[PDB]
């Protein structure tokens, strides 16, 4: 691997705006998962079998 | 691999705007998963068998 | 691996704005998980089998 | 009269959500009644001859 | 009259949410009644002949 | 009359949330009643002939 004057952006996240208003949120959960917020993952490598890279709102009931 | 003066953007995410308003959200969950928010994943590599790269609102009841 | 004058941004996150207002949030949880806030993960490497890189709102009831 | 393991909800009011924007008003009243806002009466019993339960913007020039 | 393991909710009011913006008002009243705001009466019993339970913006020039 | 293991809620008011912005007002009243704010009456019993339970913006020129 050789980079020579090579401006690079390997695996990034940027410029992520969010606006809400008057969001009268009622939420009720029982045993489950709820995700309502901004999430920003940025990885270069996730190696290994059985991996779970960057889940969100995940539920796992493996027997 | 040789990059020579090569402006690169391998695996990126950017410029993601979001606006809501008056969103009178009621949510009820039982055992499941709900996802209502902004999600931004950006990976360069996810290696390995059985992998789950960047799930969202996932449910897994493997026996 | 050889970098030579190569401005690099391997695995980053930036410029993530968020605005809320009057968000009369009621939340009720029983045994589960709720995520409503800003999350920003940025990794270069997550190695190893069975890994869980950057979960959010995760639920795991493995038997 | 008896309840067992029950969930009664006699005479309630809830989740009455209201939103008003720039309601630029010029209310002029003379001798009458003007009602312009939220109102949530919630009762169980009114027992009387000639009574008035839950009036709103009422005029009784009897 | 008896309750067992019950959850009664006789005569309640709740979660009455209100929002008003720039409601630039010019209220002018003469001898009458103007009601412009939130109101949440919540009763159980009113027992009287000729009574008035939960009036609002009432005018009784009887 | 008897309760056992119960959860009674006779005559309540709650979670009455209000928001008002820049409500630039010019209220002018003469002899009448102007009501412009939150109000939360919560009673259980009113027993009297000719009574008035929970008036608001009332005018009784009887």
UniProtKB/Swiss-Prot annotation, chains A, B, C:
Annotated compartments: Cytoplasm; Membrane; Nucleus; Synapse
Disulfide bonds: none
Top-level taxon of the source organism: Eukaryota
Region (4 X 11 AA tandem repeats of [EGS]-K-T-K-[EQ]-[GQ]-V-X(4)): 1-31
Effect of residue 21 to K: Increases oligomerization
First and last residues of every Sequence repeat: 6-20, 21-31
Tissues/organs with expression: Highly expressed in presynaptic terminals in the central nervous system. Expressed principally in brain.
Modifications made to the protein after synthesis: Phosphorylated, predominantly on serine residues. Phosphorylation by CK1 appears to occur on residues distinct from the residue phosphorylated by other kinases. Hallmark lesions of neurodegenerative synucleinopathies contain alpha-synuclein that is modified by nitration of tyrosine residues and possibly by dityrosine cross-linking to generated stable oligomers.
Residues reported in the UniProt entry to bind Cu cation: 14
Function recorded in the entry: Neuronal protein that plays several roles in synaptic activity such as regulation of synaptic vesicle trafficking and subsequent neurotransmitter release. Participates as a monomer in synaptic vesicle exocytosis by enhancing vesicle priming, fusion and dilation of exocytotic fusion pores. Mechanistically, acts by increasing local Ca(2+) release from microdomains which is essential for the enhancement of ATP-induced exocytosis.
Oligomer status and interactors: Soluble monomer. Homotetramer. A dynamic intracellular population of tetramers and monomers coexists normally and the tetramer plays an essential role in maintaining homeostasis. Interacts with UCHL1. Interacts with phospholipase D and histones. Interacts (via N-terminus) with synphilin-1/SNCAIP; this interaction promotes formation of SNCA inclusions in the cytoplasm. Interacts with CALM1. Interacts with STXBP1; this interaction controls SNCA self-replicating aggregation. Interacts with SNARE components VAMP2 and SNAP25; these interactions allows SNARE complex assembly and integrity.
Notes concerning its domains: The 'non A-beta component of Alzheimer disease amyloid plaque' domain (NAC domain) is involved in fibrils formation. The middle hydrophobic region forms the core of the filaments. The C-terminus may regulate aggregation and determine the diameter of the filaments.
Name the record gives this protein: Alpha-synuclein
Full-sequence portion shown in this chain: 37 to 99 of 140
């Amino acid at each position: 691997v050789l980079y020579v004057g090579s401006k690079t952006k390997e695996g990034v996240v940027h410029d992520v705006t969010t606006v809400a208003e008057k969001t009268k949120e009622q939420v009720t959960n029982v045993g489950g998962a709820v995700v309502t917020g901004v999430t920003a993952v940025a990885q270069k490598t996730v190696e290994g079998a059985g991996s779970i890279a960057a889940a969100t709102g995940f539920v796992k009931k493996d027997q």
